């Protein structure tokens, strides 16, 4: 009801309509009834956010708007939910449907983006991975959330290796991912050991096994397999993080 109106307001030619609608979404996402809604409403909301990004003129508003979309994932964390139980909450399931609709809409609308239009969506995906991993760190990697965020999000669409997914999206994943973990961790050698310890706090060694599975399947594309094997598997940071 209000959701499709939010989509229309975000997909407006007027800038101020889109700004005020986004500020209203900041109040709207922290609500019960949107958490009650199925994934189709999340999908509509993400395509509205996509066209909300699509009019962002200068690169500093692009960076601001990408940071705001990071804050959108930052909304669905309550400090109570980390304290109460290791099991999932309904806020967390709404976050799962939220991020899941994000990657669905993004992998759909990926191939229509202009080469001039591309880099703001690239930085968007960078901020979104930062935000979702920040949600994981806020929950401090509860195993329910970790497993379901692997399966229903990452193993579901982007890291599936399916031909339905375009190759450039996991290539962009294996570009940003190493830098994103280091963003989570924050002379140089003390920095290295703090990074090492704080990285051993993290369950990332499970996450790299998805890429191991991706390289293992031979029906997968040899390009993405080969680039993961060349870039990611030859990283020095994994050796410093015992991976």
């Amino acid at each position: 009801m209000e959701t499709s109106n939010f989509v229309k307001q975000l997909s407006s030619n007027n800038r101020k309509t889109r700004v005020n609608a986004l500020e209203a979404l900041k109040k709207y996402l922290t609500a019960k009834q949107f958490k009650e809604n199925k994934q189709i409403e999340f999908n509509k909301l993400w395509k509205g956010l996509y066209y909300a990004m699509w009019f962002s003129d200068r690169p500093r508003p692009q960076q601001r708007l990408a940071n705001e979309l990071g804050e959108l994932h930052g909304l669905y964390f309550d400090p109570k939910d980390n304290s109460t139980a290791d099991e999932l909450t309904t806020n967390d399931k709404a976050f799962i449907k939220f991020s899941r609709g994000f990657w669905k809409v993004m992998c759909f609308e990926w191939f229509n983006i202009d080469r001039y239009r591309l880099d703001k969506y690239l930085l968007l995906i960078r901020r979104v991975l930062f935000s979702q991993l920040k949600y994981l760190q806020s929950r401090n990697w509860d195993k329910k959330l970790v497993d379901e965020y692997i399966k229903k999000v990452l193993r579901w669409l982007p890291l599936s290796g399916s031909p339905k997914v375009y190759t450039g999206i996991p290539i962009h994943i294996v570009d940003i991912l190493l830098d994103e973990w280091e963003r989570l961790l924050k002379n140089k050698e003390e920095e290295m050991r703090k990074i090492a310890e704080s990285a051993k706090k993290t369950p990332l060694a499970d996450v790299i096994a998805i890429f191991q599975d991706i390289v293992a399947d031979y029906n997968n594309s040899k390009v993405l397999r080969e680039k993961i094997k060349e870039d990611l598997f030859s990283d020095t940071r994994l050796v410093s993080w015992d991976i």
């Binding site: 030619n13 009019f55 962002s56 003129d57 200068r58 690169p59 202009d114 001039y116 239009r117």
Partner: protein, 51 residues
Amino acid sequence: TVKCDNGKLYLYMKTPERAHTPAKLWERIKLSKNYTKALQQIDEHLLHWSK
């Protein structure tokens, strides 16, 4: 595009973001009268831009 209106020279910027609305299409920047400073301004506003 460097382009002059009656006296002052303006840098005109065109973004794909404003493919629609061609009245609001061109962005205008007043260039400095210092030749060096205005070339520096060009290199600033065309940062991460093609050669």
